[PDB]
Nucleic acid binder design. Structure first.
Ligand SMILES: [Mg+2]
Ligand SMILES: [Mg+2]
Ligand SMILES: [Mg+2]
Ligand SMILES: [Mg+2]
Ligand SMILES: [Mg+2]
Ligand SMILES: [Mg+2]
Ligand SMILES: [Mg+2]
Ligand SMILES: [Mg+2]
Ligand SMILES: [Mg+2]
Ligand SMILES: [Mg+2]
Ligand SMILES: [Mg+2]
Ligand SMILES: [Mg+2]
Ligand SMILES: [Mg+2]
Ligand SMILES: [Mg+2]
Ligand SMILES: [Mg+2]
Ligand SMILES: [Mg+2]
Ligand SMILES: [Mg+2]
Ligand SMILES: [Mg+2]
Ligand SMILES: [Mg+2]
Ligand SMILES: [Mg+2]
Ligand SMILES: [Mg+2]
Ligand SMILES: [Mg+2]
Ligand SMILES: [Mg+2]
Ligand SMILES: [Mg+2]
Ligand SMILES: [Mg+2]
Ligand SMILES: [Mg+2]
Ligand SMILES: [Mg+2]
Ligand SMILES: [Mg+2]
Ligand SMILES: [Mg+2]
Ligand SMILES: [Mg+2]
Ligand SMILES: [Mg+2]
Ligand SMILES: [Mg+2]
Ligand SMILES: [Mg+2]
Ligand SMILES: [Mg+2]
Ligand SMILES: [Mg+2]
Ligand SMILES: [Mg+2]
Ligand SMILES: [Mg+2]
Ligand SMILES: [Mg+2]
Ligand SMILES: [Mg+2]
Ligand SMILES: [Mg+2]
Ligand SMILES: [Mg+2]
Ligand SMILES: [Mg+2]
Ligand SMILES: [Mg+2]
Ligand SMILES: [Mg+2]
Ligand SMILES: [Mg+2]
Ligand SMILES: [Mg+2]
Ligand SMILES: [Mg+2]
Ligand SMILES: [Mg+2]
Ligand SMILES: [Mg+2]
Ligand SMILES: [Mg+2]
Ligand SMILES: [Mg+2]
Ligand SMILES: [Mg+2]
Ligand SMILES: [Mg+2]
Ligand SMILES: [Mg+2]
Ligand SMILES: [Mg+2]
Ligand SMILES: [Mg+2]
Ligand SMILES: [Mg+2]
Ligand SMILES: [Mg+2]
Ligand SMILES: [Mg+2]
Ligand SMILES: [Mg+2]
Ligand SMILES: [Mg+2]
Ligand SMILES: [Mg+2]
Ligand SMILES: [Mg+2]
Ligand SMILES: [Mg+2]
Ligand SMILES: [Mg+2]
Ligand SMILES: [Mg+2]
Ligand SMILES: [Mg+2]
Ligand SMILES: [Mg+2]
Ligand SMILES: [Mg+2]
Ligand SMILES: [Mg+2]
Lengths: 87, 67
RNA sequence: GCGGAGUGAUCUACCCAUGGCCAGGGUGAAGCGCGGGUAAGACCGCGUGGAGGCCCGAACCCACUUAGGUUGAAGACUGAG
RNA sequence: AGAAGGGGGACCGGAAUAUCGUGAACACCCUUGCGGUGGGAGCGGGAUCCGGUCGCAGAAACCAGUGAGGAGCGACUGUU
RNA sequence: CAGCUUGUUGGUGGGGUGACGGCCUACCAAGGCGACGACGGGUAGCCGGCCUGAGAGGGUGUCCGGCCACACUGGGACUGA
RNA sequence: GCUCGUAGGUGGUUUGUCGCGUUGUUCGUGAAAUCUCACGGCUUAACUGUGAGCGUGCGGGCGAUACGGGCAGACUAGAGUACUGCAGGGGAGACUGGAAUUCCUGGUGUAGCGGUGGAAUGCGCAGAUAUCAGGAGGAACACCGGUGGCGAAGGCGGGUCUCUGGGCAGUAACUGACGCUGAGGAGCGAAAGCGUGGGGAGCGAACAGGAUUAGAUACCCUGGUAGUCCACGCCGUAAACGGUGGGUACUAGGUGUGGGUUUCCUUCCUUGGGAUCCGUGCCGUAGCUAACGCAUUAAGUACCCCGCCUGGGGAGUACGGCC
RNA sequence: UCGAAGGUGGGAUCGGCGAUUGGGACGAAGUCGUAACAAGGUAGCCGUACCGGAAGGUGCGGCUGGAUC
């Protein structure tokens, strides 16, 4: 899902300067929201493999972005980790 | 390691036949009289007498501390 | 042996109601936590826990083997297992 | 599976005066009670290491699994 | 051949060596090695050299030279620079 | 078989620093014989002596940052995110519709029906086939429908609703190399088959009868069980094929189709032509190929990554190991 | 104390033989069939299941490495 205003809420919550959408922080926040929604949907319709593949792709993309932000700025990585969740 | 530290060292040596340049990582044990070193913590090492059974290096100085 | 009418479940077989009993050791199921693992898992390791027509073994319930008894202590028992 | 197969086991002394662990007296505060904390006396328990001593034998008497391998039948606990 | 190690890895205090060192010892930590192949199995003396190949390479270690290991098999000490 | 992704390998433009890789010089070392040039001596050669090369390397100092690399920065083109539109049998769940077959009940009704190249087994006469009306039940969704669309692959259309995935187009709104491949590993994965419960109209292995034939354990006919269906698991195999791994850059054209956008010819109504992006077919230039053929959707020209082969059987079999 | 050799025990690994038995290769001029190469007389292959003296047959799904309008 992630309607327009639903995206905007997380964007202003996790953004950098009032318009950021493509930074690792905002991208990881949106991907985490999508992953949580998809997993909650997948608790129902356990045979939706065509959407489970998309969920796996989102998980991989979020993992790669997390790795990039961790390598680029340890402090920002730790802040995002505490703000969102890891392990 | 109770006054010892383990330091990863890497080097590159040309393949004898194919000629490609490859990178290999090693592992040495370095003596730390005052054990102050964490994950990362780049260190320059100079090799000494056999201080222990498996120690042939000592701490010189700490450069480019862990981020 | 056959028939008629009666007597017996104080022995024994099964059942119904209401009570009682089972020394002492051992093993360690589910469930519940913690950590590891991951995106989540599945799973894994530590604890806790104390299951079972579970194990060893007295009381108790039996009766597999053997010896004795065999005008017996006893019309079915005793000793050792 | 207690598979099998091995090792140790007695006494005296020291460690050892909180050695350790059990409970917690005298004596320590407060909303004064059948109250709380510290405290460690006296009394019990278990284990280990080191040294020594005795005997033929240290599980000491009584008590207290024999074990392994191959087949047949019945899955098993039970019943006769 | 996918998990290997407990004097094993390190530290401390002694002992030992011509000499550093778990080399040995008493105590403390939980560490050390492994997919760049440990651990395990098969095979083998290594090198300068020798042969073949235009070369790269493939085979080989015999004369000779350098070293290493051994002296019936297995183990140990002493004399002595 | 496809996809994801661990390690690993590899990587856009630009600035500064180091000088590790790179490279130059110098010094030490690289034993001798033996290998080679040039000579000298055994009457010559073999043999031997001398001078120089060899000793591909290593350590040390002193020069360079052209490329790779470390560090510190910067940019938007790669890549990702943002906003607005677009198409779709992408997927899951729930409810529901019609045709048809079969079966049941009743009416009409009598002697055949079915089947083949020909028949017979079979069904009916105890009322069959056929016809009408009603009901029960499972499976599959004609027309649309195609050369089309979607999906990583396998695969995907009766209708409606709910949830959800991906892609394309446009602006360049945002980050700023965050990219490519991917050993192992993980997930998905036609049909057949397996476990548990349900369901079973039709078809239909096995099986039975008939028929053909010398024989017919088949092809043909009559039947008929599992299965095909649903729910949750397992299995992980196909000519799972484009017999062509993934990503990028470049290399004439001509002609269809699909989704967009864009000015113009803007009414020449034409929804045609022109420009661009993403695909999907065919024909065709160069080039490649043994040939067939490929040819912008390459099997052409190059780069990076992974997988695979070294004659045919034995054999994708034995043993061992994992499931 | 350590310590060669030796003894006792359960295992680990590599070979040899083995009654009997399975499949394979080659032989001759044997017996039983014609499954494939033509539309090979029922098109051929691929995975699976079942069956039968044997090659093979049948069902399910896929390919043309065949044809048809
Ligand atoms: Mg020291
Ligand atoms: Mg009578
Ligand atoms: Mg009576
Ligand atoms: Mg008991
Ligand atoms: Mg438990
Ligand atoms: Mg019992
Ligand atoms: Mg009885
Ligand atoms: Mg008797
Ligand atoms: Mg008598
Ligand atoms: Mg008796
Ligand atoms: Mg008795
Ligand atoms: Mg025992
Ligand atoms: Mg046994
Ligand atoms: Mg004595
Ligand atoms: Mg006992
Ligand atoms: Mg038998
Ligand atoms: Mg029995
Ligand atoms: Mg049986
Ligand atoms: Mg020690
Ligand atoms: Mg020491
Ligand atoms: Mg040898
Ligand atoms: Mg050659
Ligand atoms: Mg020897
Ligand atoms: Mg001799
Ligand atoms: Mg000897
Ligand atoms: Mg002398
Ligand atoms: Mg001496
Ligand atoms: Mg493929
Ligand atoms: Mg294949
Ligand atoms: Mg295959
Ligand atoms: Mg990686
Ligand atoms: Mg990389
Ligand atoms: Mg670059
Ligand atoms: Mg790199
Ligand atoms: Mg001469
Ligand atoms: Mg020389
Ligand atoms: Mg130099
Ligand atoms: Mg872009
Ligand atoms: Mg369903
Ligand atoms: Mg019916
Ligand atoms: Mg009728
Ligand atoms: Mg009718
Ligand atoms: Mg910017
Ligand atoms: Mg990839
Ligand atoms: Mg892989
Ligand atoms: Mg199926
Ligand atoms: Mg089934
Ligand atoms: Mg069933
Ligand atoms: Mg028949
Ligand atoms: Mg038939
Ligand atoms: Mg039929
Ligand atoms: Mg079956
Ligand atoms: Mg599966
Ligand atoms: Mg297919
Ligand atoms: Mg290729
Ligand atoms: Mg390609
Ligand atoms: Mg390509
Ligand atoms: Mg086109
Ligand atoms: Mg063509
Ligand atoms: Mg080719
Ligand atoms: Mg196999
Ligand atoms: Mg096997
Ligand atoms: Mg034999
Ligand atoms: Mg034939
Ligand atoms: Mg055939
Ligand atoms: Mg025929
Ligand atoms: Mg045929
Ligand atoms: Mg058949
Ligand atoms: Mg078949
Ligand atoms: Mg077919």
């Amino acid at each position: 899902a992630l309607t327009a205003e639903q995206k905007k809420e997380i964007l202003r919550s996790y953004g950098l300067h009032e318009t950021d959408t493509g930074s690792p922080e905002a991208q990881i926040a949106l991907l985490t929201k999508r992953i949580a929604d998809l997993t909650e949907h997948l608790k129902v319709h356990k045979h939706d493999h065509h959407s489970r593949r998309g969920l796996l792709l989102l998980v991989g993309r979020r993992r790669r972005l997390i790795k990039y932000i961790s390598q680029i700025d340890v402090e920002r990585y730790r802040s995002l980790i505490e703000r969102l969740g890891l392990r | 390691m109770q006054k010892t530290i383990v330091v990863e060292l890497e080097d590159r040596m040309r393949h004898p036949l194919y000629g490609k340049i490859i990178r290999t990582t090693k592992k040495v044990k370095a003596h730390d009289e005052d054990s102050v070193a964490g994950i990362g913590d780049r260190v320059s090492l100079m090799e000494t007498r056999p201080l222990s059974a498996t120690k042939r290096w000592r701490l010189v100085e700490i450069l480019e501390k862990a981020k």
